[PDB]
Amino acid sequence: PPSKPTVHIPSSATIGSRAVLTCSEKDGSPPSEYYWFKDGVRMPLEPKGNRAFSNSSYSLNEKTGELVFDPVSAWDTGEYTCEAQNGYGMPMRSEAVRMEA
Amino acid sequence: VYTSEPDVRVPEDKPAKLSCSYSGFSNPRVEWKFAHGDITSLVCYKNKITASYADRVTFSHSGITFHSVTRKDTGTYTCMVSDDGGNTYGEVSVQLTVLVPPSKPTVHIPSSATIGSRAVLTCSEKDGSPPSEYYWFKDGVRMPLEPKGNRAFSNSSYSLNEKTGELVFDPVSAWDTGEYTCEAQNGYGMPMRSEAVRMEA
Amino acid sequence: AQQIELDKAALGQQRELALKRMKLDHQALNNQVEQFNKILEQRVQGPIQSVRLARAAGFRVDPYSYTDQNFYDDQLNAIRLSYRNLFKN
Amino acid sequence: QQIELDKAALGQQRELALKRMKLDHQALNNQVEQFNKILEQRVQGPIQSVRLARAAGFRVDPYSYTDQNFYDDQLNAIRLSY
Amino acid sequence: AQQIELDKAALGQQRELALKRMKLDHQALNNQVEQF
Amino acid sequence: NKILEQRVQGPIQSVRLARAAGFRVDPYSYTDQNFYDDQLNAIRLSY
Amino acid sequence: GWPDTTIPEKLTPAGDYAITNKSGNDITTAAGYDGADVIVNNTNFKGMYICGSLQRAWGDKKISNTAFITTATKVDNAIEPSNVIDMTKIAVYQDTHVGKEVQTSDDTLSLLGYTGIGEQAIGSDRDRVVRISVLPETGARGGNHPIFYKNSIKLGYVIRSIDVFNS
Ligand SMILES: [K+]
């Protein structure tokens, strides 16, 4: 399965800045993917949709969890967390962490 | 959101099912969308199939089904689902591969070679669905992945891209003459053996 | 100018508050029907919601037994049923 | 320069109370179809419930199919605004 | 002419927006009878 | 929604609770249908 | 030993089980099963059976899988209910691992279950019963009436059972 994955988060970025969030795991066999939360609800694959995230802007490297915020909008504040899963066992989740604009 | 079988493999014209198991919603709304490389389209919207595909495709909010398929329908599908207004949300992606077996592939033989020089043998095929790997022959028998070993072949030398066909006599030897062929297969259907050709050293 | 300047945005700030107490009033008004347009459905599934129930915890319930043709299709089948056995040996 | 703010703040009373007046239309436009629906289901629900249970093969109990009691849900969806 | 121009235009809105409600007030009335 | 969520998962639990000890079951009162008119005060009439 | 119950409807058997409560959900547990407005069965092999399917053949590894059978008329990718059984109306949905070639798959099958969740009895809709040409049938006599013999049966994906009628 995935082990509990590592992450890296700046707790607060500047409004209209750039920011990056990652989630890493070691025991992924097959390689564990990564999917992000925000206040619990899982993050889309793109902000491009009627998602409440049409204003925001980012991309994903779901195999790497390399979540972007380029630019960082004001509303992009949230409780972000990744959910590691190789589609086997159980999806393991990282710590609870915030981010602020 | 939840699914059961992402790696679907089917022939042409035959069915499919694309499970989209969701949970925890009150007034959901479902969104399927096609995707392959540059191409993108909507299959469904508001629990309703898009007119481009409704004439053959069905619907059910556990997952959809194609009454029939083509290789063009291959790609990637994504059952984006949301509560009414995004109070709750999830996603899932599914990718597909219709099974067209390969055809008699195109071959590439310099029928003559200089010895100590370099020759290049390649093979090429169109109906790879999935991409049809190649496995080379000499004199009817099959050539290794590496000539190193108790092969009767390590005296010569070559290098492969067996999925692609890039076979190179690096270098050629006088011993290397024989009757060569590429053997096409995508792990489905019969292997399409190609035209056999000499290689004059 | 400052007296205006904070009032330049006071209205748009009230425009933020305004739509949202208009939203909540809309969030429940539709939801009033969401409660209602399916409580009525339960009356449509009166029987099975009781029989799919008791069979689950855990009884031996056997509603299928009936004897009287009070449906107008049952006897009408019996009309034809008795009409065929009559001619056909 | 008190005019551009009043030209717009006419103007916020206006299109707000608009929506207020609009939403009070759906307060009752939804209510009527929350009521006129009854008089169909007053007859149609039972017709479908019995059309349902007949599929399995149950008894039908031809006295209790007509609710007539729980279809006093009109009693709370009856206006007397005042 | 701010205190003579933009005082009467609002009166139209103050007028109409009530008469909107007068219908909706009138609407429940005759809708009640139809509902009665 | 808790109501309709209970509404089977009451009696079920209640019976399976009682039957774990081995009572007579009273196979009409397992389902109540009256006390589960507590919807009646949990209904909007927002107005 | 071939059974008698048609499918309810046209359907293209192409995938896995799926049932959903409320027409707005998907559920995979008991409390969710009973805790249900209704049951929907968004499945593609709904009114079918659960036979064992030893699934042999010449030169075919990839061990046996389960089958699903009814009577129905087959049209090129799907089926439709017919109840007048002939040599053409037989139906199966077992994956015998066929690539690009005739298989010649001998098989054996034993009646073992059902699929049509949401239903609540079998042998009650005569229109779905498989008869060759004629259906034996009676009505009340004297003051005596007919009967059936109830007999529980398996269901497949869900642990519950369902009630058969038997003459
Ligand atoms: K086999």
| Chain F partners within 8 Å of C62 (Cβ) | none
Long-range contact list for F28-34, CB < 8 A, 24+ apart? F30/C54, F30/C57, F31/C50, F31/C53, F31/C54
DSSP three-state, residue D52: helix
G-contacting chains (≥3 CB pairs under 8 Å): B, C, D, F
- Report how far ligand 1's centroid is from the alpha carbon of G57 (Å): 6
Collect all residues with Cβ–Cβ distance below 8 Å to B169 and sequence separation of at least 6: B113, B118, B119, B121, B156, B157, B158, B176, B199
d(CA F33, CA B103): 68
Give the tokens for residue C85.
């056995």
Question: What's the CA gap between B186 and B100, in Å, rounded?
Answer: 9
Contact at CB, E32 and D6, closer than 8 angstroms: no
DSSP letters spanning chain B:
-B-S--SEEEESS--EEEE-B--S-SS-EEE-EEEETTEEEESBSSS-B-TTTTTTB---TTEEEESS--GGG-SEEE-EEE-TTSSSEE--EEEEEEEB---S-EEE--SB--TTS-EEEEEE-S--BS--EEEEEETTEEP-SSS-STTTTTTS--B--TTTT-EEESS--GGG-SEEEEEEE-SSS--EE---EE-B-
Name the resolution in angstroms.
Answer: 3.8
Q: Pick from B27, B160, B165: which is nearest to B87 by CA?
A: B27
CA distance C61 to C54: 7
Enumerate the residues of chain G whose CB falls inside 8 A of the CB of residue F12: 34
D11 prior amide bond cis, ω within 30: yes
Total number of residues shown for chain F: 47
Q: What Rg, from alpha-carbon coordinates, does chain D have? A: 24
Q: Least CA distance to C39: which residue of chain F? A: F4
Taking Cα atoms as reference points, which of F46, G56, F20 lies closest to residue C36?
A: F46
The residues, any chain, with a CB within 8 Å of residue D6's CB and separated by 6 or more, are E2, E6
- Looking at beta carbons, which residues of chain B come within 8 Å of A44? 80, 89, 91
Say if the Cβ atoms of C53 and F31 lie within 8 Å: yes
Phi, psi at residue A86, to the nearest 5°? -95, 20
Residues with Cβ < 8 Å from B104, sequence gap 6 or more? Answer: B184, B192, B194, B195
- Contact D78/D31 with Cβ under 8 angstroms? no
Task: Choose the closest CB to A41 out of B78, B80, B89.
Answer: B89
Main-chain phi, psi angles of B47, to 5 degrees: 60, 30
B189 C-alpha to ligand 1 centroid (Å): 18
Torsion-angle region of residue G79: left (phi > 0), alpha (psi -120 to 50) or beta? beta
CB contact under 8 A, D14 and E17: yes
Angle at the Cα of B155 from the Cα atoms of B153 and B159, rounded to 5 degrees: 65
CB A76 within 8 A of CB A83: no
- Which phi and psi angles does C40 have, rounded to 5°? -70, -30
CA distances from B89 to B6, C31, G38 (A): 20, 19, 24
3-state secondary structure chain G: CCCCCCCCCCECCCCCCCCCECCCCCCCCHHHHHCCCCECCCCCCCCCCCCCCCCCCCCCCCCCCCCCCCECEECCCCEECCCCCCCCCECCCCCCCCCCCCCCCCCCCCCCCCCCECECCECCCHHHCCCCCCCCCCCCECCECCCCCCEEECCCCCCCCEEECCC
With 0-12 / 13-18 / 19 or more C-beta atoms within 10 angstroms meaning exposed / middle / buried, residue B99 is buried
Pairing mode, if any, of strands B89-90 and B80-82? Answer: antiparallel
| A39 Cβ contact partners less than 8 Å away, ≥ 6 residues apart | A78, A79
Q: Name the experimental technique.
A: cryo-EM
| Residues in chain A within 8 Å Cβ distance of B1 | 42
Cis peptide before C47 (omega within 30 of 0): no
Structure token pair of residue G23: 């027409």
Cis omega before residue A30 (within 30°)?
yes
CB contact under 8 A, G145 and C67: yes
DSSP string, A13-63: --TT--EEEEEE-S--SSPPEEEEEETTEEP-S-S-SSSS-SS------TT
CA distance A12 to A31: 30
The C-alpha angle with vertex B189 and arms to B188 and B191, in degrees rounded to 5, equals 95
Helices within chain F (DSSP H only): 2-9, 11-21
Report residues near ion ligand 1: CB below 5 Å.
Answer: G 60
- Give the type of residue at C80: R
Given CA atoms C45, C48, C50, C53 in this order, what sign does their dihedral have? negative
What is the DSSP track for E1-36? -HHHHTTTHHHHHHHHHHHHHHHHHHHHHHHHHHT-
N-term to C-term CA, chain G: 16
Q: Which amino acid is at F32?
A: D
Instruction: Spell out the domains of chain B, with CATH numbers in brackets.
Output: 1-98 (2.60.40.10), 99-201 (2.60.40.10)
**Residue A26: how many other CB atoms lie within 10 Å:** 12
Rounded to whole angstroms, the maximal C-alpha distance in chain G is 63
Does chain D touch chain E (at least 3 C-beta pairs within 8 Å)?
yes
Q: Coil, strand, or helix at residue F37?
A: helix
Q: Do chains B and A touch (3 or more CB pairs under 8 A)?
A: yes
Mutation target vs B (from A36, A37, A39, A51; most B CBs, 10 A cutoff): A51
Ligand 1 centre to CA of E25 (Å) is: 77
| D14 to chain E, closest Cα gap in Å | 7
Angle at B23 between CA B18 and CA B24, to 5 degrees: 155
User: Which chains neighbour A (Cβ–Cβ under 8 Å, 3 or more pairs)?
Assistant: B
- Give CA–CA dist D31/F18, Å, rounded: 44
How far is the C-alpha of G111 from the C-alpha of G3, rounded, in Å? 8
